[PDB]
Structures are given as C-alpha cells and as structure tokens.
Design a protein around this ligand. Structure first.
Ligand code: HEM
Ligand code: HEM
Ligand SMILES: Cc1cc(N)nc(C[C@H]2CNC[C@@H]2NCCNCCc2cccc(F)c2)c1
Ligand SMILES: Cc1cc(N)nc(C[C@H]2CNC[C@@H]2NCCNCCc2cccc(F)c2)c1
Ligand SMILES: C[C@H](O)[C@H](O)[C@H]1CNc2nc(N)[nH]c(=O)c2N1
Ligand SMILES: C[C@H](O)[C@H](O)[C@H]1CNc2nc(N)[nH]c(=O)c2N1
Ligand SMILES: [Zn+2]
Lengths: 407, 411
C-alpha cells in the first residue's frame, strides 16, 4: 500500500502514498513489465467531474464547503441536460497546471506551477486558431527569455467537431524524400510534409524549412498558415573551440511546443492544447541531430574532428556526441535563448521529486524517459528509483488526425 | 495472447509468445510500474510441480518429450522427493539448467554467448578449503591468460536451509575499501562493510588503493573461512590512455575477470546458494560505474582537473568529456594487454542480434531496458530504441540476502 523509493547514490529513501489515488491502467501486469513500451457518456462523465472538483476544492482548502457542494450539483445538473459541462477559468488553470504536474515522462516539472494558461475556448475558426497560436508563440518566446505556456481550444463534443493542430509541434522542419533514396531535412516529418504539399504548400525544399501550420476548427477540413518568420526564433549552431563547426550549416529553433496532445480534465477532452517550455540540450544534440532516423550527422562530425572511425571501440561516436552537444548549449547561451543542460535539468528534477514526496506524498515518474539519452549514470536521476503511475488531469497521446478525419 | 515490440529506429515489429510460460511475479501492477526499482526451505508439496516443469522443458529441448526415458525420470524424481524431500540433478540437467538461468537473465546484455558456458560441478564439495580449491580452478580456467572464457561453478544445493554453501564475497575479485576516521574512503567504497568483516575474521589488510580482497567461504552451514587468492591467478590491467601520457600517473588499474558470486541459482525447484559465474567486462562497467559513480572511485574531478576543462559551469559538459576519455583509456588498456573486453556499441549491437534470433527461435526474449541500456551514450546504441518485455522465466538467478545478515554463528 505504502511504497518506498531509494536513491542508490545518497541512500535517501522516500515513501509514496500518492499512487493509491491513481486511477488509469499502466500496461504492466504481475506477469509482465511494459515500462519500455512507447504506447501500451453521461454515465461516465459525472464521476470524472466529481473526482476532479473534489481535488480542486481540496487544494483551495474549502473541501466540503457550501461553495464546493453547490458547484458539484451545478455540474451534475449541466450533464443531465447538456450531455457535457463547462470549466470555470480557475478550474481550467488548475486543471492544466496539474496535467503538467502529473506528466510522469517530463523532467521539467519543477516549473509546473508557473504555467501561463491562455483560454481559447471562444475560438470558432482556423484563422482564429492561427491568431491564438501566434500570440502563444510570441508570448512564450519573449525575445529569447522563454516562458511556459499552454493555449486551450474548445473541448470535444460529439467527436465530429474536434479542434486539432495537425502538426506534432508548432515549429518543426520539413522532410522530403529524394531521387537518391536519401532524405533532405527532418525524416520524422516526411509524411506530414507530404500532407502539406498536397494541401498546397510551396516547399522551399531545403534542410531547415519551417513547416506551415495545418489547423482544424469544429471538424472542418484543415487549413494552411505560415507562422510569421519574425516569430520563429532560431539559433545557428557553432562551437566555442571548433571553428569549422559553422559550415555543417546547422540551426535549431528556440521553442519546443508540443501540439498533438490531448488534455483531459474532469472527463472533458481538449484535443487541441499546444504547450511549450524550453529545451534541455540533449533533446536537440543527441536526439534530433544524432538519431540514425533523424538528421544523423554523427558521421559528418567525427570526420571533421579527424577521429579514428575504423573501430567502434575508439568511442568516436561518443567523442563527437559530446562536442555536438557542447555546441548546442554554447550557441543558445551566446544568443541568450533559454536552454538547460541535462545535468542541471536532472538535479532540479530531483529537488522537485523530494518536494512532491513531502508535499503531495509522491511524484509519478517514468525512469526510462527521465534519464537523459547521454551520460545516464553521471546524472543523479539514474540512481533514483521512481514509481510510474497515471494521475488525472493528464496529457495523453491521440490518433493522428489524417488517419481519422473525414474530408 | 501475442504481444508486439517495436524498434523505433528500424520499425521492426516482433511478436512475443514466450511470456505465456512465465510464473513468477514482476513487482508491477495494472495500477503501478516498478520497472526501475532495484529489488521489488521448501516443502515436498511445492517441489514436484517445479521439478516436472523443468524436466518437461529439459526433455522438450533434447527432442525426447514423452519418451520412455522422460517418463522414467519423472517417476524417479517423483519417488526421490517423497522419500528424501529433495532430489539430485543429473549432470546433463544441471548444465542445461545453468545455461537457461543465463539465457533467462533479463538484465544481462551479454546473453548472446549463453550456450557457450563452461559448467563446473562442485556438488561433491564438503568444506571451505574444498571451496577455495574449486574457485581457484574456476578463475584460472576462466582467465585463460586474458582470453577470458565464461564459466560457472555449482556447489551443493540448499537442503534444510541450515546447511548452506555461501561465497560471502559479492565478487571473487574485488578491491578493499576502508572508511578512514576523517570520513574519506580509500579503495572501493562499495566494498567498505565487507572489508570490515574480512578484517574482523583476521585479514591483515595492506590498506592500499587496490588490495585484492580475500575469499570468505561458508561450507555446509558452517562459519565461513578466509583464503588469499594466489596473486599469480589475479589478472590485472594498469589503466593508460592512448594519447594522454599523464593518465597512467593517476595510478589506476582494474582486475580482468568479473565473477559474480552472490546470486542464487534456481533450477527445477532446487536452490544453489553458491554458484559464482564469470564472463568478461563491458568497458562501461569499469569506466562509467566503477570509476565515475560518486559512490565508487569518483575520479571525474581528478581527470577533469588534469584535462584543464572548464569546471566552473556544468554546461561545459566537462563531466561528459572526462567520462569519454576514461572509457577510452579502459578499452585501450585492455586491448593492448590482450585481455578480452567489449565496448558498449559492439555489445548492445550483439544483443539486438541475439534478441531478434530469440524471438524467431524461442518466441521471446525477456529483457529489462533500465539495465540493458548502457550508462553512457544511451541513444546512440541501438537498444535505446528497442521496446522490451520484462518477465521471469525459470531457471533463474535470484538475489539473496547477504549472509552476515542471516547466518547463525557457532564460534
Ligand atoms: C520548461 C521546461 C521543460 C522541459 C526542460 C521539458 C522537458 C521534457 C523532456 C526532456 C521530455 C521527454 C521527451 C523526449 O525527450 O522526447 C518531456 C516530455 C513531456 N513534457 Fe516536459 N518539458 C518542459 C516543459 C513542459 C511543459 C510546459 C509541459 C506542459 C505543460 C510539458 C509536458 C510534457 C509532457 C506531457 C511530456 C511527455 C511527452 C510524451 O509522453 O511524449 N513539458 N519534457
Ligand atoms: C561474458 C560477457 C558478459 C557481459 C559483457 C555481461 C554483461 C552484463 C552487464 C553489463 C550486466 C549489468 C550489471 C550492472 O551493470 O550492474 C549484467 C548483469 C547480469 N549478467 Fe551478464 N554479462 C556477461 C556474461 C554473463 C555470465 C557468464 C552470466 C552468468 C552465468 C551472466 C548473467 C548475468 C546476470 C544473471 C545479471 C543480472 C545482474 C543483476 O541483476 O545484478 N552474464 N551482465
Ligand atoms: C513542452 C516541451 C518542452 C521540452 N523541453 N520538451 C518537450 C518534449 C518534446 C520535444 N522533443 C521531443 C518531445 N516530443 C513529445 C512527443 N513525443 C513523441 C514520442 C512518440 C513518437 C511517435 C509515436 C509515439 F506514440 C510517441 C516538450
Ligand atoms: C558475468 C558478468 C559479466 C559482466 N561483464 N558483468 C557482470 C555484472 C557485474 C559486473 N559489473 C557490475 C555487475 N554487478 C553484479 C550484480 N550485482 C549488482 C546488482 C544489485 C546492486 C545492489 C542491490 C541489488 F539488489 C542488486 C557479470
Ligand atoms: C524503446 C524506448 O521505449 C524508446 O526508445 C524511448 C526510450 N526513452 C525515451 N526517453 C525520452 N526522453 N524520449 C524518448 O523518445 C524515448 N524513447
Ligand atoms: C534506480 C535504478 O534502477 C538503478 O540505479 C539501476 C538503473 N540501471 C542500472 N543498470 C545497470 N546495468 N546497472 C545498475 O546498477 C543499474 N542501476
Ligand atoms: Zn512495469
């Protein structure tokens, strides 16, 4: 019932009580662990609503008060009649901050309480969506001093009337399939990039082409829009000691802003809810640049360092990997754009976990995702046992709209 | 029910039916994943089911399932249990047994070698001094003058749990650590307590930064006994760097043979509480964990100082830079001295190949991602990108409490 988690580096032990408030399923059984798997009505709505309002009135310290009881009935009476209900602004902010608090795969939650929430529930069209997105991008970019933000479009109704941002992020680079068999740009976005050319985008067909936004209002055909270029802050990638680095021609955008997720608060489903913070260095250095199936620039870099690529055991991939990541951190900082290195991100996440243990009774955390994809064991999160569980409100993945939407 | 795992780099999907043959619990529930928790005397009743299962396995694999010789062995194990409360494994069964304990070992990235294990049967051993002698032969044979060979040495199974063979050392070769009275620690900090025990049992400690520990051996439930391993048997590699000449002045070395001596080997219900096994090292085990963990030799700072890195801001990635050099030095030193070692790239690649094969030939490969992915350069090794299913098959290697914690002292 109570569970202890030990840090095997500091011997510090914490007791988890928060997992018993967990509702949804993990994918794991007594017989099988599924921790490394990337993805494992009116009758239904009212309990969900009640469970959420109960934690909301508790957090504001008015559990079981007349204000509590009255909102509880008001929501019940709106469900029986309208087959859905509306959140109050205050409940919406709480909902969203907490969906971030509960994101077990996010290393950056020490920040959770300072989320800026933009309520876009009065939006009705794709142009309106575009306007909200641009105000989001600009607010959160803040000339390089980035701020956490989420913009919340109207909730799902019959399911035929969904708002959706088809992009997986607001700002991403195009992917094109070429005559050779090679890929130009970002291979992760090839399918989406084709969906842009078939909606009518003029692709410049380079390596770092900022994709257009494809916006869906109230279930309608989606629509193309270019983000004003002046709003997409980008950093050219150079190295502090290696002068040749600049001619690789690398740049990355400043703003990571996830836009394909679904926000569930008290049974209500917000299918367009883009949110953004700022990068941990390794996300770009290790994953975007180095993954075999992304930009995969490791061979090129190691060749420019004049390292021995004859045998795997020179650790030349490892040597290059560090420099590539040195250069991302250096470039961002020298341009005064917010970024965090993996040592700092994880040290901070450990502070946060210790905070959540004494102040909430626990902290759901998915180790497989928290441990950075380089230098695992030299970060303190490597030695830290974590319990993974699913709390609500939450962010969830959702089918890609193009498989699903009807034209 | 069939379960699919995806490789997110190659988009290869594989199908696991083997998980269906799993009986032990994982520590996980529908409501909670404990995949990163380090650790989450039998009666006659329980024993025959386990015996039967195992012997069914054994005989399936030799293609003799349901043969006269299979039924006759079942009946014979049956009788032996009801009459003696335990049973003896045939030699061939034990070999098969120990090989599968490896093959089922889901935290081991080194299973591609699983069949080529050399089994030493020390089940006639009755005394500590007998145990020293079997262990010495293990080590010499396994060391092979640097051309390491995997091997395990199986001492007599548990009987009533009052007569256990234990190897008190966590590994056969390991360095003393000594808590000084100023809170500092000389040698290996992981081995402090056990070192103290050795000292209590009469070991006269040199007190250097790398003193090979003495074997502490328990036979047949008896109080355990000290023995120095012959130093000519302990292969060690001094650590240098191919380009940094100052590296050798750090005074580092490591032993060449990793030999785990604290696990329990379970086969068809029988428990072997002393079963040291050994392989060869993946470079990162020494380089990342043994030298660079804060709770071990902790040399990152000393190494960064000497490279004159920018140590004033963690954003220089001075730690990441120092770590790669140290790992380079470990691999270089081993290769140059002709002692077997594998780098993490080549090991993880081998393991992906094994895993794929195991799905085609066995219908599964239980693997634990938290353990399989190396503690440096995770995502540039192909395992990071591989979905894995973790489950418990028997035969298996299990953990067991440390003996100083359970052992009944006699004087
Ligand atoms: C402000 C600094 C932030 C940092 C450094 C950060 C970092 C990360 C990292 C490293 C991941 C792992 C995913 C990967 O590497 O592919 C992640 C996932 C995630 N982040 Fe955070 N994040 C930040 C802000 C936010 C905000 C503001 C939200 C929402 C309010 C958020 C929600 C999530 C969610 C839901 C996931 C899981 C994504 C998935 O399951 O695919 N993050 N984040
Ligand atoms: C020969 C080359 C081998 C290599 C490179 C290798 C590699 C590894 C590594 C890197 C680990 C993770 C342990 C850690 O990092 O703390 C491990 C664990 C393990 N290995 Fe292997 N191994 C090899 C051979 C063997 C042999 C001979 C056996 C047994 C007969 C074996 C069985 C195991 C088991 C049972 C574990 C689980 C350890 C634990 O849970 O603490 N492997 N191995
Ligand atoms: C808001 C925020 C800040 C920061 N720093 N970082 C983030 C994570 C995103 C950035 N960099 C990757 C990650 N993206 C989140 C979405 N993950 C895709 C995993 C995936 C792929 C395919 C199929 C699946 F089912 C799942 C968010
Ligand atoms: C046979 C073989 C070959 C290789 N290369 N490598 C190995 C693993 C050992 C060497 N490098 C470290 C590792 N360790 C052996 C297993 N014990 C640690 C697990 C553990 C720790 C604390 C509490 C627990 F409950 C469990 C075995
Ligand atoms: C197979 C495995 O689940 C998959 O590669 C995961 C591993 N850990 C990860 N961790 C983070 N932070 N991001 C990822 O995309 C992944 N991918
Ligand atoms: C808490 C966490 O599971 C623990 O520190 C584990 C993580 N993965 C590991 N993986 C290996 N190979 N060896 C280890 O000691 C550990 N430690
Ligand atoms: Zn699990």
């Amino acid at each position: 019932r109570f569970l202890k988690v030990k840090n095997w580096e500091t011997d510090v032990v914490l007791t988890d009580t928060l997992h018993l408030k967990s509702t949804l399923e993990t994918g794991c059984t007594e017989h099988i662990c599924m921790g490394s798997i990337v993805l494992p009505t009116k009758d239904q709505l009212f309990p969900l609503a009640k469970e959420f309002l109960d934690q909301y009135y508790s957090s504001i310290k008015r559990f079981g008060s007349k204000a509590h009881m009255d909102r509880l009935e008001e929501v019940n009476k709106e469900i029986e009649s309208t087959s859905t209900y509306q959140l109050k602004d205050t409940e919406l902010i709480y909902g969203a901050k907490h969906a971030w608090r509960n994101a077990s795969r996010c290393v950056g939650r020490i920040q959770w309480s300072k989320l800026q929430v933009f309520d876009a529930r009065d939006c009705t069209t794709a142009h309106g969506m575009f306007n909200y997105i641009c105000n989001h991008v600009k607010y959160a970019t803040n000339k390089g001093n980035l701020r956490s933000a989420i913009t919340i479009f109207p909730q799902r109704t019959d399911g035929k009337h969904d708002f959706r941002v088809w992009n997986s992020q607001l700002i991403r680079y195009a992917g094109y399939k070429q005559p050779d068999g090679s890929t130009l740009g970002d291979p992760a976005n090839v399918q989406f990039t084709e969906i842009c050319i078939q909606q009518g985008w003029k692709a410049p067909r380079g390596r770092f082409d900022v994709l257009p936004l494809l916006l869906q209002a109230n279930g309608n055909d989606p629509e193309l829009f270019q983000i004003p270029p002046e709003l997409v802050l980008e950093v050219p990638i150079r190295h502090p000691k290696f002068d040749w680095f600049k001619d690789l021609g690398l740049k990355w955008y400043g703003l990571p802003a996830v836009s394909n997720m679904l926000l569930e608060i008290g049974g209500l489903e917000f299918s367009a809810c883009p949110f953004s913070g700022w990068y941990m260095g390794t996300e770009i250095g290790v994953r975007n640049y180095c993954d075999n199936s992304r930009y995969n620039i490791l061979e090129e870099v190691a060749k420019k360092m004049d390292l021995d690529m004859r045998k795997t055991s020179s650790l030349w991939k490892d040597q290059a990997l560090v420099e590539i990541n040195i250069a991302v951190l250096y470039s961002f900082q020298s341009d005064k754009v917010t970024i965090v290195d993996h040592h700092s991100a994880t040290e901070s996440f450990i502070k946060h976990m210790e905070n959540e243990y004494r102040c909430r009774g626990g902290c759901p955390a998915d180790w497989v995702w928290i441990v950075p994809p380089m230098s695992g064991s030299i970060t303190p999160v490597f030695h830290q046992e974590m319990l993974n569980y699913r709390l609500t409100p939450s962010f969830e993945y959702q089918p890609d709209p193009w498989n699903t939407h009807v034209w």
